[PDB]
């Protein structure tokens, strides 16, 4: 397949460059480990108001104040 690649690179280099760019753009996001970073960056952006919940009495995971240590923090985004 080296002869075919050399012939098509000598004849039409534009199509070879386009196909190489397309192949990298297709097979590269499945290899990089930074796609989940984009996922939680997009999910961490506050478009809507964080509507509070009524305190029934047993909710240990949610805080009572935003400065409380419980809750989803973004020190990873500040670090990156």
């Amino acid at each position: 397949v080296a002869a075919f690649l050399k012939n098509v690179w000598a004849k039409e280099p534009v199509l070879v460059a386009s196909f190489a760019i397309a192949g990298l753009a297709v097979i590269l996001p499945t290899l990089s480990p930074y796609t989940k970073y984009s996922l939680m960056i997009n999910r961490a952006t506050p478009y809507n108001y964080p509507v509070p919940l009524r305190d029934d009495g047993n909710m240990p995971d949610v805080p009572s104040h935003p400065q409380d240590p419980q809750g989803p923090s973004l020190e990873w985004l500040k670090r990156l």
Binding site: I41, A44, T45, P46, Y49, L80
Partner: protein, 70 residues
């Protein structure tokens, strides 16, 4: 007598051949320069876009703080 004649030794050389000096670099050099420029631009854009995302998050949480009075 006096006429228009060439000198005894003749005139100087006169060129009649195509002269193209072939100035420039090889293809590997320019392609590597372009790839390096692309990588530098991609790195700078990644840094500035991450900073802009953090700034946008800060402005959004400022609006979140200001919402109930409005």
């Amino acid at each position: 007598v006096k006429q228009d004649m060439p000198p005894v030794g003749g005139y100087g050389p006169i060129d009649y051949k195509r002269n193209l000096p072939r100035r420039g670099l090889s293809g590997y050099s320019m392609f590597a320069v372009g790839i390096g420029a692309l990588l530098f631009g991609y790195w700078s854009m990644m840094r500035w876009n991450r900073e802009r995302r953090r700034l946008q998050i800060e402005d959004f949480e400022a609006r979140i703080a200001l919402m109930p009075l409005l």
